[PDB]
UniProtKB/Swiss-Prot annotation, chain A:
Cross-link (Glycyl lysine isopeptide (Lys-Gly) (interchain with G-Cter in SUMO2)), chain numbering: 36
Entry protein name: Small ribosomal subunit protein uS12
Family under the similarity heading: Belongs to the universal ribosomal protein uS12 family.
Residues with PTM N6-acetyllysine: 134
Modified-residue entries (3-hydroxyproline), positions: 61
GO molecular function, one term: structural constituent of ribosome
Curated annotation (Swiss-Prot), chain B:
InterPro entries in the cross-refs: Ribosomal_uS4, Ribosomal_uS4_CS, Ribosomal_uS4_euk/arc, Ribosomal_uS4_N, S4_RNA-bd, S4_RNA-bd_sf
Gene Ontology biological process terms in this record: cytoplasmic translation; positive regulation of cell population proliferation; ribosomal small subunit biogenesis; translation
Protein name: Small ribosomal subunit protein uS4
Compartments where found: Cytoplasm; Nucleus, Nucleolus
UniProt region (Disordered), positions on chain: 161-180
Subunit structure comment from the entry: Component of the small ribosomal subunit. Identified in a IGF2BP1-dependent mRNP granule complex containing untranslated mRNAs. Part of the small subunit (SSU) processome, composed of more than 70 proteins and the RNA chaperone small nucleolar RNA (snoRNA) U3.
Function, in words: Component of the small ribosomal subunit. The ribosome is a large ribonucleoprotein complex responsible for the synthesis of proteins in the cell. Part of the small subunit (SSU) processome, first precursor of the small eukaryotic ribosomal subunit. During the assembly of the SSU processome in the nucleolus, many ribosome biogenesis factors, an RNA chaperone and ribosomal proteins associate with the nascent pre-rRNA and work in concert to generate RNA folding, modifications, rearrangements and cleavage as well as targeted degradation of pre-ribosomal RNA by the RNA exosome.
Keyword Nucleotide-binding set for record: no
Broad class of the protein's primary localization: cytoplasm
UniProtKB/Swiss-Prot annotation, chain D:
Compartments where located: Cytoplasm
Protein name: Eukaryotic translation initiation factor 5B
PTM: (Microbial infection) Cleaved and inactivated by the protease 3C of poliovirus, Coxsackievirus B3 and Human rhinovirus 14, allowing the virus to shutoff the host cell translation.
Transmembrane segments: none
Assembly mode: Interacts through its C-terminal domain (CTD) with the CTD of eIF1A (EIF1AX) or with the CTD of EIF5 (mutually exclusive) through a common binding site. Interacts with eIF1A (EIF1AX) from the location of the start codon by the 43S complex until the formation of the 80S complex. Interacts with ANXA5 in a calcium and phospholipid-dependent manner.
Family the UniProt entry places it in: Belongs to the TRAFAC class translation factor GTPase superfamily. Classic translation factor GTPase family. IF-2 subfamily.
Lineage: Eukaryota, Metazoa, Chordata, Craniata, Vertebrata
Role of this protein: Plays a role in translation initiation. Ribosome-dependent GTPase that promotes the joining of the 60S ribosomal subunit to the pre-initiation complex to form the 80S initiation complex with the initiator methionine-tRNA in the P-site base paired to the start codon. Together with eIF1A (EIF1AX), actively orients the initiator methionine-tRNA in a conformation that allows 60S ribosomal subunit joining to form the 80S initiation complex. Is released after formation of the 80S initiation complex.
Gene of this entry: EIF5B
Species, as recorded: Homo sapiens
Residues of the full protein shown: 988 to 1065 of 1220
RNA sequence: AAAUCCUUUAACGAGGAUCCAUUGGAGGGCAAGUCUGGUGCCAGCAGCCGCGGUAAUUCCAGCUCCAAUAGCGUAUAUUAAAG
RNA sequence: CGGGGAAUCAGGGUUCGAUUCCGGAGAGGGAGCCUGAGAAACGGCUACCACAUCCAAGGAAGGCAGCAGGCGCGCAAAUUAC
């Protein structure tokens, strides 16, 4: 039962205000705990240096070696694993290059197949991977 | 601080569902019938009609004796009679709700140039207007989306300079005349 | 099936301590021990045992891992013994 | 730049590989490139700085991590 | 202010009018191909369900088609959908 | 920083508002004061704290969160113009 009385504005507001914390989205958002834990720290894209290339196996129902890159970020200097998008894009990357990585799409969660990766590489050595894939540019030498 | 205004407005609303048969057809019929460039031009007229309908709807809710409703209602009806989507007989606020997109698309300069028989196709009219051949009153307009006023209808003439009307041969005729 | 003397970006390995959930961890004839993943078609169809000779697809980026291409048996092992494979037993 | 060539041809003669090069004073991105090296080969994670101003944020970041910086105005010392 | 841009107007300027329209898709959600080469649970696609293990409607291509259009993808904060 | 407001939106609401108008605040951090109707002023001074320029080593001079511009920082932002 909800109190409906004309002088229950404080009771309703107090209840609604404190009961919003049991909402997953509101608590993750408003409490400054997601931000510090987030490797980017509330930034759409982030830049890093490549450690090494790595082959991550897919989930149980369908088997394949997903090509990925271990990258250390520039701002906070912590290690993450980024998934290179299109076919043969791993060839264009080399170890110890400067790489711009973006969120995958699902708001900092995993993908259908590739487990334990949040991020995907968008630029390599200040050149877009789409341009290197479509051959509109060439890796600067 | 700068002596500039930042009063800019969006004139079209995109549809809620992007891919929907029955809708896409209806918009393409409108384009096909009135030779419009893209679906932005149909959404523009939908948005303008919607805003007029919302103004009529929010006026209806007020009482029949209110000075504000009377003044605003008369002004809206006067403007819609002026533009030529109604007549003096059907000049009640209730009838504003009984308009549709056809009524507004009929008043495009492109459409009127085609309907008065200056151009011989709905596609030819848009080109003819854009090429600076058409003029209303003594003013040369090249805007297909120029919405013609009811009293301004009875004179759309060829701009005098124009080869078609004025009497001066263009590049093609000049070049053919020199090599003739 | 025919003999396959293929040493073209892929190495022969002796399976040792095959513990994992597909992990494997065998000892390659040329280099050091590596984790050789059970490739799609070898998941349920072909069974690799605790001590076995395998041709592993040397995946050269990281080099601390690989994937098992082919399983061998006694006759093919004895043949491989004959040409090129160390006096290491089969 | 002349000094940078001089240091690189010395490293070439002494047989040491070099990853990154830069002109001007040392910054926190430079010590971070020295840090991202530290994972690979602990010895190689060093900055050879000749006749340039070390920054406080770079120096304290270098001391907080396992990154050493060789500062010297006379090249003999470097 | 002096110029620029625009408007005005002599001369030149359209037949692959080569004076060239892109960005994303074509199994469902969701508009559009069980067409033809290539690869063979490898390479990759896929927001989600899923497609790939030798006739792939979904991968890399060719052709064709759809969507919006001088714009259209992608990531991320936020609003409606969220009774 | 707070308002005037902004985005979205059936009705109710939710979220944003450093940013051209109004009010407040501070000129690297604090503190003290001269002049003046008005300042605890920084394109005024005096001292300390942090940085840093010239030097004949005796002393001297500092303040872009004004317009340009540069370095740094980072995913993120223009011309040393008339």
């Amino acid at each position: 039962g909800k109190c409906r009385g004309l002088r229950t504005a404080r009771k309703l507001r107090s209840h609604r205000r404190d009961q919003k914390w049991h909402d997953k989205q509101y608590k993750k958002a408003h409490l400054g705990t997601a931000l510090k834990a987030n490797p980017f720290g509330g930034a759409s894209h982030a830049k890093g240096i490549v450690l090494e290339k790595v082959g991550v196996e897919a989930k149980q129902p369908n088997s394949a070696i997903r090509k990925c890159v271990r990258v250390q970020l520039i701002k906070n200097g912590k290690k993450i694993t980024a998934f290179v998008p299109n076919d043969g894009c791993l060839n264009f990357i080399e170890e110890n290059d400067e790489v711009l990585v973006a969120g995958f799409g699902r708001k900092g969660h995993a993908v259908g197949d590739i487990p334990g990766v949040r991020f995907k590489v968008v630029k390599v050595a200040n050149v877009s991977l789409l341009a290197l894939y479509k051959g509109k540019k060439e890796r600067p030498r | 601080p700068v002596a500039r205004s930042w009063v800019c407005r969006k004139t079209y609303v995109t549809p809620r569902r992007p891919f929907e048969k029955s809708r896409l057809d209806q918009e393409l019929k409108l384009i096909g019938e009135y030779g419009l460039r893209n679906k932005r031009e149909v959404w523009r007229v939908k948005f303008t009609l919607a805003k007029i309908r919302k103004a009529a709807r929010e006026l209806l809710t007020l009482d029949e004796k209110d000075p504000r409703r009377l003044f605003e209602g008369n002004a809206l009806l006067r403007r819609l009679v002026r533009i030529g989507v109604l007549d003096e007989g059907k000049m009640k606020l209730d009838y504003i709700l009984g308009l549709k997109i056809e009524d507004f698309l009929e008043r495009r300069l492109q459409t009127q140039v085609f309907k008065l028989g200056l151009a011989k196709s709905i596609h030819h009219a848009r080109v003819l207007i854009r090429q600076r051949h058409i003029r209303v009153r003594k003013q040369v307009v090249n805007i297909p989306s120029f919405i013609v006023r009811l009293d301004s209808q009875k004179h759309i003439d060829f701009s005098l300079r124009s080869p078609y009307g004025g009497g001066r041969p263009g590049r093609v005729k000049r070049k053919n005349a020199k090599k003739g | 099936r025919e003999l396959v003397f293929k040493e073209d970006g892929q190495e022969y390995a002796q399976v040792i301590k095959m513990l994992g959930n597909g992990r494997l961890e065998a000892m390659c004839f040329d280099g050091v021990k590596r984790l050789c993943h059970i490739r799609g078609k070898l998941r349920k169809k072909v069974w690799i045992n605790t001590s076995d000779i395998i041709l592993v697809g040397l995946r050269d980026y990281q080099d601390n891992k690989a994937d098992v291409i082919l399983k061998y048996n006694a006759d093919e092992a004895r043949s491989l013994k004959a040409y090129g494979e160390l006096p290491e037993h089969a | 730049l002349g000094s940078l060539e001089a240091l690189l041809e010395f490293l070439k003669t002494s047989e040491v590989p070099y990853a990154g090069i830069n002109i001007g004073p040392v910054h926190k991105k430079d010590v971070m490139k020295a840090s991202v090296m530290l994972e690979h080969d602990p010895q190689y994670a060093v900055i050879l700085a000749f006749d340039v101003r070390i920054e406080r944020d770079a120096q304290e970041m270098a001391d907080s991590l396992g990154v050493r910086i060789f500062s010297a105005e006379i090249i003999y010392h470097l």
